[PDB]
Motif scaffolding. Structure first.
Motif, PDB file in Angstrom:
ATOM      1  N   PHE A   1      13.549   0.518 -10.385  1.00 53.09           N
ATOM      2  CA  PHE A   1      12.967  -0.752 -10.806  1.00 53.09           C
ATOM      3  C   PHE A   1      13.093  -1.821  -9.729  1.00 53.09           C
ATOM      4  O   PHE A   1      12.267  -2.739  -9.677  1.00 53.09           O
ATOM      5  N   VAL A   2      14.077  -1.699  -8.837  1.00 50.42           N
ATOM      6  CA  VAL A   2      14.115  -2.556  -7.656  1.00 50.42           C
ATOM      7  C   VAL A   2      12.925  -2.263  -6.751  1.00 50.42           C
ATOM      8  O   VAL A   2      12.297  -3.188  -6.218  1.00 50.42           O
ATOM      9  N   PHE A   3      12.572  -0.979  -6.599  1.00 47.88           N
ATOM     10  CA  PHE A   3      11.345  -0.626  -5.876  1.00 47.88           C
ATOM     11  C   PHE A   3      10.105  -1.206  -6.550  1.00 47.88           C
ATOM     12  O   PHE A   3       9.197  -1.688  -5.869  1.00 47.88           O
ATOM     13  N   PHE A   4      10.049  -1.175  -7.885  1.00 48.94           N
ATOM     14  CA  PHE A   4       8.882  -1.728  -8.572  1.00 48.94           C
ATOM     15  C   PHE A   4       8.787  -3.240  -8.401  1.00 48.94           C
ATOM     16  O   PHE A   4       7.689  -3.777  -8.227  1.00 48.94           O
ATOM     17  N   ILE A   5       9.925  -3.937  -8.420  1.00 52.06           N
ATOM     18  CA  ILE A   5       9.916  -5.385  -8.212  1.00 52.06           C
ATOM     19  C   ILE A   5       9.511  -5.725  -6.779  1.00 52.06           C
ATOM     20  O   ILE A   5       8.726  -6.654  -6.550  1.00 52.06           O
ATOM     21  N   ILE A   6      10.005  -4.954  -5.802  1.00 47.85           N
ATOM     22  CA  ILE A   6       9.630  -5.174  -4.404  1.00 47.85           C
ATOM     23  C   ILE A   6       8.145  -4.909  -4.197  1.00 47.85           C
ATOM     24  O   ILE A   6       7.465  -5.656  -3.485  1.00 47.85           O
ATOM     25  N   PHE A   7       7.608  -3.881  -4.858  1.00 53.14           N
ATOM     26  CA  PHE A   7       6.173  -3.625  -4.782  1.00 53.14           C
ATOM     27  C   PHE A   7       5.365  -4.739  -5.428  1.00 53.14           C
ATOM     28  O   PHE A   7       4.323  -5.137  -4.897  1.00 53.14           O
ATOM     29  N   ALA A   8       5.832  -5.256  -6.562  1.00 51.32           N
ATOM     30  CA  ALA A   8       5.089  -6.301  -7.252  1.00 51.32           C
ATOM     31  C   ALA A   8       5.100  -7.604  -6.471  1.00 51.32           C
ATOM     32  O   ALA A   8       4.117  -8.352  -6.502  1.00 51.32           O
ATOM     33  N   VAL A   9       6.188  -7.885  -5.760  1.00 50.48           N
ATOM     34  CA  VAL A   9       6.218  -9.068  -4.906  1.00 50.48           C
ATOM     35  C   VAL A   9       5.351  -8.851  -3.674  1.00 50.48           C
ATOM     36  O   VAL A   9       4.478  -9.668  -3.358  1.00 50.48           O
ATOM     37  N   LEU A  10       5.559  -7.734  -2.978  1.00 49.25           N
ATOM     38  CA  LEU A  10       4.959  -7.514  -1.672  1.00 49.25           C
ATOM     39  C   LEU A  10       3.476  -7.191  -1.754  1.00 49.25           C
ATOM     40  O   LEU A  10       2.774  -7.323  -0.747  1.00 49.25           O
ATOM     41  N   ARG A  11       2.978  -6.790  -2.924  1.00 45.68           N
ATOM     42  CA  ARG A  11       1.547  -6.562  -3.057  1.00 45.68           C
ATOM     43  C   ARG A  11       0.777  -7.874  -3.027  1.00 45.68           C
ATOM     44  O   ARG A  11      -0.276  -7.969  -2.389  1.00 45.68           O
ATOM     45  N   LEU A  12       1.305  -8.910  -3.670  1.00 44.34           N
ATOM     46  CA  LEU A  12       0.571 -10.161  -3.815  1.00 44.34           C
ATOM     47  C   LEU A  12       0.596 -11.028  -2.566  1.00 44.34           C
ATOM     48  O   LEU A  12       0.079 -12.150  -2.607  1.00 44.34           O
ATOM     49  N   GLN A  13       1.181 -10.558  -1.474  1.00 48.53           N
ATOM     50  CA  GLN A  13       1.031 -11.248  -0.206  1.00 48.53           C
ATOM     51  C   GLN A  13      -0.396 -11.055   0.304  1.00 48.53           C
ATOM     52  O   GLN A  13      -0.961  -9.969   0.162  1.00 48.53           O
ATOM     53  N   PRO A  14      -1.007 -12.089   0.887  1.00 47.87           N
ATOM     54  CA  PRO A  14      -2.405 -11.957   1.313  1.00 47.87           C
ATOM     55  C   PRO A  14      -2.589 -11.102   2.546  1.00 47.87           C
ATOM     56  O   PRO A  14      -3.714 -10.662   2.809  1.00 47.87           O
ATOM     57  N   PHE A  15      -1.530 -10.845   3.311  1.00 44.00           N
ATOM     58  CA  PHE A  15      -1.700 -10.144   4.575  1.00 44.00           C
ATOM     59  C   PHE A  15      -1.751  -8.634   4.395  1.00 44.00           C
ATOM     60  O   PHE A  15      -2.407  -7.947   5.182  1.00 44.00           O
ATOM     61  N   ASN A  16      -1.093  -8.101   3.370  1.00 40.57           N
ATOM     62  CA  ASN A  16      -1.044  -6.663   3.156  1.00 40.57           C
ATOM     63  C   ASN A  16      -2.192  -6.154   2.301  1.00 40.57           C
ATOM     64  O   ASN A  16      -2.109  -5.044   1.765  1.00 40.57           O
ATOM     65  N   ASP A  17      -3.263  -6.940   2.179  1.00 41.55           N
ATOM     66  CA  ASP A  17      -4.433  -6.535   1.412  1.00 41.55           C
ATOM     67  C   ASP A  17      -5.114  -5.329   2.046  1.00 41.55           C
ATOM     68  O   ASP A  17      -5.701  -4.504   1.341  1.00 41.55           O
ATOM     69  N   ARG A  18      -5.016  -5.192   3.368  1.00 43.80           N
ATOM     70  CA  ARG A  18      -5.529  -4.010   4.044  1.00 43.80           C
ATOM     71  C   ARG A  18      -4.668  -2.779   3.811  1.00 43.80           C
ATOM     72  O   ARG A  18      -5.110  -1.673   4.126  1.00 43.80           O
ATOM     73  N   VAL A  19      -3.456  -2.933   3.286  1.00 44.26           N
ATOM     74  CA  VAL A  19      -2.616  -1.770   3.044  1.00 44.26           C
ATOM     75  C   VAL A  19      -2.859  -1.267   1.636  1.00 44.26           C
ATOM     76  O   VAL A  19      -3.342  -0.150   1.439  1.00 44.26           O
ATOM     77  N   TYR A  20      -2.554  -2.097   0.649  1.00 42.08           N
ATOM     78  CA  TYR A  20      -2.552  -1.646  -0.731  1.00 42.08           C
ATOM     79  C   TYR A  20      -3.924  -1.661  -1.377  1.00 42.08           C
ATOM     80  O   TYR A  20      -4.014  -1.483  -2.594  1.00 42.08           O
ATOM     81  N   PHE A  21      -4.986  -1.880  -0.616  1.00 41.87           N
ATOM     82  CA  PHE A  21      -6.339  -1.750  -1.128  1.00 41.87           C
ATOM     83  C   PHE A  21      -7.235  -1.101  -0.084  1.00 41.87           C
ATOM     84  O   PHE A  21      -8.399  -1.478   0.076  1.00 41.87           O
ATOM     85  N   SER A  22      -6.707  -0.105   0.629  1.00 41.86           N
ATOM     86  CA  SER A  22      -7.367   0.383   1.836  1.00 41.86           C
ATOM     87  C   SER A  22      -8.603   1.215   1.518  1.00 41.86           C
ATOM     88  O   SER A  22      -9.590   1.174   2.263  1.00 41.86           O
ATOM     89  N   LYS A  23      -8.570   1.979   0.425  1.00 42.57           N
ATOM     90  CA  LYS A  23      -9.732   2.778   0.061  1.00 42.57           C
ATOM     91  C   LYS A  23     -10.898   1.898  -0.364  1.00 42.57           C
ATOM     92  O   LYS A  23     -12.059   2.260  -0.138  1.00 42.57           O
ATOM     93  N   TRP A  24     -10.612   0.730  -0.946  1.00 43.82           N
ATOM     94  CA  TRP A  24     -11.674  -0.219  -1.251  1.00 43.82           C
ATOM     95  C   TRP A  24     -12.322  -0.753   0.015  1.00 43.82           C
ATOM     96  O   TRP A  24     -13.516  -1.060   0.014  1.00 43.82           O
ATOM     97  N   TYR A  25     -11.563  -0.854   1.101  1.00 49.00           N
ATOM     98  CA  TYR A  25     -12.179  -1.196   2.373  1.00 49.00           C
ATOM     99  C   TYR A  25     -12.937  -0.019   2.961  1.00 49.00           C
ATOM    100  O   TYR A  25     -13.925  -0.220   3.675  1.00 49.00           O
ATOM    101  N   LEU A  26     -12.503   1.206   2.669  1.00 43.74           N
ATOM    102  CA  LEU A  26     -13.227   2.372   3.161  1.00 43.74           C
ATOM    103  C   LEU A  26     -14.544   2.594   2.434  1.00 43.74           C
ATOM    104  O   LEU A  26     -15.423   3.267   2.975  1.00 43.74           O
ATOM    105  N   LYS A  27     -14.702   2.054   1.228  1.00 42.17           N
ATOM    106  CA  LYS A  27     -15.955   2.170   0.499  1.00 42.17           C
ATOM    107  C   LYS A  27     -16.905   1.017   0.789  1.00 42.17           C
ATOM    108  O   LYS A  27     -17.874   0.828   0.051  1.00 42.17           O
ATOM    109  N   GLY A  28     -16.640   0.244   1.838  1.00 40.57           N
ATOM    110  CA  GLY A  28     -17.566  -0.773   2.293  1.00 40.57           C
ATOM    111  C   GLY A  28     -17.666  -2.000   1.410  1.00 40.57           C
ATOM    112  O   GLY A  28     -18.774  -2.441   1.092  1.00 40.57           O
ATOM    113  N   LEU A  29     -16.526  -2.562   1.014  1.00 36.86           N
ATOM    114  CA  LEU A  29     -16.502  -3.795   0.235  1.00 36.86           C
ATOM    115  C   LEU A  29     -15.180  -4.510   0.468  1.00 36.86           C
ATOM    116  O   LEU A  29     -14.122  -3.876   0.478  1.00 36.86           O
ATOM    117  N   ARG A  30     -15.244  -5.820   0.674  1.00 41.37           N
ATOM    118  CA  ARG A  30     -14.048  -6.599   0.965  1.00 41.37           C
ATOM    119  C   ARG A  30     -13.323  -6.975  -0.315  1.00 41.37           C
ATOM    120  O   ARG A  30     -12.888  -6.105  -1.065  1.00 41.37           O
TER     121      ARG A  30
END
Lengths: 683, 683
Positions: free
Chosen positions: A17-46
């Motif tokens: 659950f510490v991993f889940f809290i770290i994921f929930a915090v670190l996902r909502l950073q604007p810079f890691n949008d290319r990491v945790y949504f990478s397949k959406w960038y591979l399908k040609g949409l921002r």
């Protein structure tokens, strides 16, 4: 060791659950949008910490198939098959076997010569049931109630995948795959090239269709130099862009010259050996080609039928996909394949030999109770009522996972030593090798070579007397180690993988040190495929631990259930959002997965025979020999009725999809689409 | 019992040469020229006692192939394979194992508790070698020297038959076989017939080639009435032609009327149910057809590939030959085949159960020495120094042959209960059933259930003490029974079959009582095929008796050799002169014969393990486990490199022979040749 299992599971859950809290915090950073949504960038949409589990279940399965693919959806269906199988096994194992075993106090008869356990066998299994007893007429029909029902689930799912495959592959988009056949071996001739051999074979034998052949270049040394050139330009970027925020005298080993003149050397070698590959070298043209046809029907004919007299010449595979062909193994001559296999059965026999020592080094650390009661010394590892739980519940799982943190890559390299010109078959045989390695060392060489340590007073003080009976009691006693291995390797290992650190750290490092813009999307592919090398036969390892210990102690069953229920949501979120699928198979691995689950069933009953043969249960073994007959007969049923939807592509659908495609778009060539599809990715 | 074996072999030889003299006299009669030269009549052309054996060897093999066929030549090659295998086995078994065993007098140590034999174990095997001894390091390498070398012979022959098949079938005359595919199952529809289903399947899926389909009529009751009508006209000939050499009041049961009015009844039924078969009965049209193409390539494609989604609908066999199709089994619906098989695995389990009693009834008669020394009574069967030899050497073979004189026909009927729409597969599975029946009752239920009678003092006086050791000694002691079974069933049974009495007596009876001339050639077909129901797995039974007892006593080896050497000349004379070959397979039964010889090898080593495990030979069993690995690995080699010349007809030769036929004769239709080829032989 329930006092130990509780502490181990508490550490694992309160770190997960510490991993889940770290994921929930670190996902909502604007810079890691290319990491945790990478397949959406591979399908040609921002507060709302785990508000992603219901989001990962809203998306229905056909939209997931048309979005992600068809391999990963049925990979999720493996986990749903696990949840389907082990729910009523655990239900009928709680409410039946636990009131059977809790009654009869035969391990409270503990001062039979040396057997010391505490308050866990009363929840465990057949060890707690005494000799030649009457309780076993429960277990065997429960054995039937496990192996009849799981065969029903394995029939129904394997029906709903062959139908799923034939609905997908007869409606997917056009690749230059369904028109192309690899022609792997071909006999030499006094003719000047292999190309005229392939022409004068296929113009005569398939005179109607025959679009365009394409031979296979060698290109090993050239591709190795291209790889080295790109790596050297990566370091040439790194050392030079250190200078853009610094002063003179840049590097150490004039020194930036010490990569650019090497670049001039490599380019002078590139243009030379790319000139000297297709001009003066018929020797560097391997005896293989990619033939091609203008109907799918003709390629389906060409790659299922015997071609010539010899079943070693002109043999035809299915030519996997041009972004799937693992190049530099088409450059292996065919006659040296069966050598390279027989080498890597021997070295695999070494990898099942050298890795016995890091197995047992775990369990000696895991059963110090089996050492303290067996060897008097306590100024070493000692009972302190809490650190015993840490040394027996947490560190064996962490240690066994860290000894396995390399071997999927090792078996991937070892499968790359054989030919297997596709990633889609390298990963299949790597999964097979890691399944055998889990079945031998992680399961058998753990149980047999560790239960001797777990009951070392029995083998020590009274030897060669009840040595079947002690090893029969000790195998259900060794469920706690697999409980901790589930709670460490599977549980937190799937609960900690969401924060995909190994691509994210590399993505931040490549953000901080490269050139410019217009490059920030090639590193979104750095999260690779689903783990079919790594995470595929881990599932089958937990199937083995479920099915083997299902007529045996049901303290592995709920932990397997909650592992499956968590990992389904985890991998479904990952497949929706961060995954690439570098190959469409499509789901051509169920004759392997179904077969290994059936082999898990067969090993389950053949080990249940060994557990019933240690309590002198006379009229219990004759009503259990029927199950290795019944399951293997069921496997021969499923190999006949459902498997040739995976192997043999039928001609009715191959003509149906051809006529439907000529109704969708008419009047286009295939030579503009497919003549230059299988040229080597150098060119 | 060499005093008994000599008398048995003397009776058998001095009756077999009586058969040869009777054949040499009776052949030179001018009237039996239609019997002993019947195949020469079928090919359209009209002191020195054994002067036929050199005449049967002058004719070379390719002329024999172009004269007789291709099944019977390789059937002779089975016997030549036997002579090839067992010659150096007997050579290296005389000059090695016999000087090993004759030395050590361990059965002259006979007054160990109760073991009484006489002067034969000194020539026999491992029974004569004492416990944990040093002689066994001979036998195991001789075991290698048997199973490595016989695998070389089984590789070389199985190479020279696949080459022989592919040379024959790519050059034989045109049948309406190589253009035709059976389409065994087909799903129902609201359309008015199966014919439009087959049309709208094959016009869409094979639009180019598709010559002409032909559905399968039911015609069971009609063909049964035609058979009864022809039988009734045969008796109508017999009773009426008794009147042509007699006076009034002909028969008894006006009375010649009592068949001719029945003929009028049968013809009134024939015209009715032949009218009522193709007019008002779509119900009597089975879901199957014979499709046909205009190239061999298209039929080779159609009958190797999966057709649809289900691998139960539209499944395609190879449509055997119109004079080979065993009709009235195309009228079985497909979904009821797997029931009819599972019935006849159960009843076969009964035929391996009821026939244990006539087995043991033989051996109690065969080892009265094992009864007289085990039960005191001699006013019954008594030692009289000559009739003991008759009761132990001649009557067990005659009795065991007369209990087997019906069961090839029984297994033929039992295979006819299943579908198998060809004679060429009914005879294959009948050979398989009679091979299992020889391996269970004639071999295993003879040895185990007879050696207990042969050493009944051992099981009687000292029970449950050395019961592995006694049954280990007794199995090489039971070679004399198989010696007598060779000398009676094989030896004289092949030496007495030349005088083909069962067709000749019927031929004389049909000469004496039928109508007129112009009929004296339909009874030359009464000698049927070679015995592939009857005489094919008898060869494999003697292969089993050779290979099992080759590291065991070599007193079966020379008798097997002279049996093979005689039966080769006998069957080659028969195949040259008197045989029909009602079907060209062509030699598509070597994946069965080769497999059963390999299974004979595997059973040989697994019984050699059991014989070495009764003399406490410790370091002898570990150097023998390698052979069931090695032989099964060799079988998986031959299943991959040579067998798909028998199963999968390659497309290169299918196009090659098509272009060569269009070069030989151009411009002929196939609809005039092949559209009406598979209509039922009623019509």
């Amino acid at each position: 060791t329930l006092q130990d299992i509780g502490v181990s599971a508490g550490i694992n859950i309160l770190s997960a659950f510490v991993f889940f809290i770290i994921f929930a915090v670190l996902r909502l950073q604007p810079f890691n949008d290319r990491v945790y949504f990478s397949k959406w960038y591979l399908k040609g949409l921002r507060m709302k910490f785990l508000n992603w589990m219901p989001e990962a279940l809203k998306m229905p399965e056909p939209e997931l198939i048309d979005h992600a693919g068809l391999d990963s959806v049925v990979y999720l269906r493996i986990y749903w098959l696990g949840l389907k199988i082990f729910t009523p096994i655990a239900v009928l194992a709680w409410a039946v076997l636990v009131p059977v075993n809790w009654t009869n106090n035969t391990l409270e008869m503990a001062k039979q010569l040396r057997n010391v356990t505490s308050s866990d066998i009363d929840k465990l299994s057949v060890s707690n049931i005494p000799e030649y007893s009457m309780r076993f007429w429960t277990h065997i029909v429960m054995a039937y109630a496990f192996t009849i029902w799981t065969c029903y689930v394995l029939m129904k799912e394997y029906e709903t995948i062959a139908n799923m495959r034939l609905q997908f592959v007869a409606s997917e988009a056009r690749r230059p795959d369904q028109f192309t056949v690899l022609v792997r071996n071909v006999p030499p001739d006094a003719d000047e090239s292999v190309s005229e051999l392939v022409e004068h074979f296929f113009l005569v034998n398939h005179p109607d269709h025959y679009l365009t052949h394409q031979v296979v270049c060698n290109a090993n040394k050239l591709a190795d130099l291209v790889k080295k050139k790109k790596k050297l330009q990566n370091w040439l970027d790194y050392y030079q862009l250190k200078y853009a925020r610094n002063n003179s005298q840049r590097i150490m080993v004039v020194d930036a010259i010490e990569h650019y003149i090497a670049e001039i050397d490599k380019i002078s070698k590139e243009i030379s050996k790319e000139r000297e590959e297709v001009v003066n070298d018929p020797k560097a043209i391997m005896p293989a080609a990619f033939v091609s046809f203008k109907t799918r029907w003709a390629a389906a004919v060409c790659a299922q039928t015997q071609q010539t007299r010899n079943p070693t010449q002109w043999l035809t595979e299915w030519a996997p996909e041009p972004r799937d062909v693992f190049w530099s193994n088409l450059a292996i001559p065919y006659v040296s394949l069966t050598v390279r296999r027989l080498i890597m059965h021997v070295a695999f026999f070494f990898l099942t030999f050298f890795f016995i020592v890091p197995i047992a080094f775990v369990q000696s650390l895991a059963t110090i109770e089996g050492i303290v009661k067996a060897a008097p010394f306590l100024k070493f590892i000692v009972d302190d009522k809490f650190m015993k739980s840490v040394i027996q519940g947490f560190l064996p799982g962490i240690a066994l996972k860290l000894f396995l943190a390399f071997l999927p890559s090792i078996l991937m390299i070892m499968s790359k030593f054989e030919g297997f010109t596709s990633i889609s078959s390298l990963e299949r045989r790597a999964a097979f090798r890691y399944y055998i390695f889990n079945l031998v060392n992680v399961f058998l060489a753990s149980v047999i070579a560790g239960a001797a340590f777990e009951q070392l007073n029995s083998f020590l003080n009274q030897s060669a007397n009840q040595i079947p009976k002690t090893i029969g009691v000790a195998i259900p006693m060794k469920a706690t180690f697999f409980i901790t291995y589930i709670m460490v390797d599977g549980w937190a290992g799937v609960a900690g993988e969401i924060l995909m650190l190994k691509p994210l750290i590399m993505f931040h490092l490549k953000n901080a040190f490269l050139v410019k813009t217009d490059k920030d999307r090639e590193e979104a592919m750095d999260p690779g495929s689903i783990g079919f090398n790594t995470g595929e036969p881990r599932i089958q390892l937990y199937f083995l631990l479920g099915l083997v210990y299902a007529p045996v102690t049901p303290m592995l069953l709920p932990f397997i259930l909650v592992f499956f229920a968590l990992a389904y949501i985890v991998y479904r979120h990952q497949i929706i959002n961060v995954y690439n699928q570098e190959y469409e198979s499509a789901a051509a691995f169920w004759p392997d997965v179904h077969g290994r689950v059936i082999a898990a069933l067969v090993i389950s009953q053949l080990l249940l025979m060994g557990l019933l043969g240690t309590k002198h249960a006379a009229l219990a073994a004759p009503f259990l020999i029927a199950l290795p007959v019944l399951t293997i007969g069921f496997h021969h049923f499923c190999k006949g009725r459902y498997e040739p939807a995976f192997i043999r592509y039928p001609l009715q659908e191959a003509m149906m999809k051809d006529t439907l495609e000529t109704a969708r778009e008419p009047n286009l060539n295939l030579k503009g689409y497919l003549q230059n599809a299988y040229v080597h990715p150098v060119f």
